[PDB]
Amino acid sequence: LQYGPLAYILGEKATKKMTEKSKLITVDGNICSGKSKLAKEIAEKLGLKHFPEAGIHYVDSTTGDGKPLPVQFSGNCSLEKFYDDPKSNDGNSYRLQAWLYASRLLQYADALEHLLSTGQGVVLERSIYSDFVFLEAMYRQGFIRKQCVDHYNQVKKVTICEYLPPHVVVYVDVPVPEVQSRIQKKGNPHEMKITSAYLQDIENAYKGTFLPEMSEKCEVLQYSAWEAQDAEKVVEDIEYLKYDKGPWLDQNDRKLHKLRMLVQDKLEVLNYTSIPVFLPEVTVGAHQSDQVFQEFTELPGRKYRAGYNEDVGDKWIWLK
């Protein structure tokens, strides 16, 4: 029985599988701040599904066979190419950011769908709420134009409002001089080109806008570089939180029915990520968009709806 009004009427309600342990945790932080390690530990010490940070190819992992698709089907946006030539004239800087916001928006919907359907909590590296720190980091370095920020805010103000903020925000703070050092140790040829001004702007966005804005509706835990290494301390603090603010208190089976209907319809989630604002960075011509679409339908298991592809081993199509 696929979820819908009939399932909700027959008993499938959100406040029958959610418990005190059904929480949504996002582990924010700067580059090389150790969040990926901390978040992976919080999830396993609380029985929570873990979501690795949404990258360029996140959507591919959740659809089809799970393997990444050729980059042409992601818009050719590259994180490696962003570091080398952040001032590129082909708009790869903003077209990267716009694609990443959609990926996080898609991931956040998948997380909420898991929390509501199964009742199990989830841990995210970053979220649509914190994703703007990179945008104003790009803008303040001159990597993107103002029209790119205006377009970004238009997409955010029509998509963010439809969802609920995380229960707990975990911020791992690492000063910029230390972050530069940790970037060098991993020694990624493209990442090492990151400038300290870019890293500093991320913190200013994190410090000035994200934390003071999420603290009035979420539980905020601001650890440091040394404190973050103590996972048992983090799990202990989270389990002692009070949860006395934010919109998750003013929710019922009726409101969560609407939320689940939206988050299971992925085309509905991504509806305004492609609004007809003709920004050069994200606009694609009709000839190139047409050519790529035809190539996409020729990939294995993509021509038809899932379960109707006879070239990947689907049978009973004539009775299905």
Binding site: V59, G75, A98, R254, H257, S274, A286, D290, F293
Partner: protein, 347 residues
């Protein structure tokens, strides 16, 4: 809304219309409109934003005003006849008030100003109920009182509706405003043939409802409310572009499509009554409707508008919306012309 409450409200919208259609007493006709209006407001405000509040408020003020004129017609008809039976009215003043009351409920010109703004301010699902189901009750009453309707008045509302609806839609880019004006234009066709053959009012109403339902359903499938948001459809659901082309040509009255049948039969009936100037004027003026239908075909199916990079993420997910009866409606709305003499089942 709670899903059960949503169904209870829809059944009350339908019950009020059914009460109007099965009633022999003028009081029960008025009650049906009152019940129908009471249960339509909540679905017009299911989104809870300022634009829906304004749309419901304008809808409430117009329908309440019409409902009071309808009562005044009934009481005047009671004073001069002493009976409540739903039939021809027994007083010229009662006829005019009832006709103008039903013209306001239908949104016919010059009482049309609410239709475009109310439709724009409510979701596509509620616009569909507004422009298709809400016209069944006022047309049911007009079908019964037409022997005593002033001929000049009813034909004047028809001509104005065709003109205003035709001219209004030319200046529109919002789809819900385009459909609202297309509705006013077709209301004039239904009521222009009413004195001559009310069976061609049902034919035009039924074909229009099918075509309008098909259009809204395909706008809901892709969650499109603007011309430019509808011009991205070729890069997501190419099939939905060809179906929109076929349904838009049919709405324009182009043969060999179904939407030609109403225009064809209305002209046949009016010329039988030696009405030549009016059908010619209506047919030519209906080309205004065809023009702004053809614009949507250009930007949706017959050209490939610029796309967006984030569109590539939509190629990976299917359409999960119900699209109920869409395969059946699109065929009925385009391929029914060979079965035209079936219209006599409405007799």
């Amino acid at each position: 809304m709670n899903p059960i409450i949503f169904i209870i409200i829809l059944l009350t919208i339908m019950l009020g219309t059914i009460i109007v259609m099965i009633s022999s007493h003028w009081l029960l006709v008025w009650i049906g409109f009152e019940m129908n209006m009471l249960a339509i407001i909540p679905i017009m405000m299911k989104n809870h934003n300022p634009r829906a509040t304004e749309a419901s408020t304008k809808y409430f003020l117009t329908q309440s005003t019409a409902s009071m004129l309808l009562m005044m017609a009934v009481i005047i008809n009671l004073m001069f006849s002493g009976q409540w039976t739903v039939m021809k009215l027994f007083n010229p003043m009662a006829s005019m008030l009832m006709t103008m009351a039903l013209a306001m409920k239908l949104g016919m010109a010059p009482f049309h100003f609410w239709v475009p703004e109310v439709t724009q301010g409510i979701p596509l699902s509620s616009g569909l109920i507004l422009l298709t189901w809400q016209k069944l009750a006022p047309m049911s009453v007009l079908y019964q009182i037409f022997p005593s309707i002033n001929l000049n008045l009813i034909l004047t509302l028809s001509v104005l509706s065709i003109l205003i609806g035709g001219w209004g839609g030319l200046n529109q880019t919002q789809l819900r405003k385009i459909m609202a004006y297309s509705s006013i234009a077709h209301m004039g066709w239904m009521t222009a043939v009413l004195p001559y053959n009310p069976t061609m009012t049902l034919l035009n109403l039924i074909i229009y409802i099918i075509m309008t339902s098909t259009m809204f359903t395909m706008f809901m499938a892709n969650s499109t409310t603007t011309t430019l948001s509808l011009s991205h459809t070729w890069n997501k659901t190419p099939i939905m572009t060809v179906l929109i082309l076929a349904t838009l040509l049919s709405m324009g009255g182009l043969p060999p499509l179904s939407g030609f049948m109403p225009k064809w039969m209305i002209i046949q009936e009016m010329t039988k009554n030696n009405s030549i100037i009016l059908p010619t004027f209506m047919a030519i003026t209906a080309l205004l409707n065809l023009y702004f239908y053809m614009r949507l075909t250009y930007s949706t199916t017959l050209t490939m508008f610029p796309s967006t990079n984030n569109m590539k993420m939509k190629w990976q997910f299917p359409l999960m919306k119900k699209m109920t009866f869409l395969p059946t409606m699109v065929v009925l709305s385009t391929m029914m012309l060979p079965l035209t003499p079936m219209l006599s089942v409405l007799e």
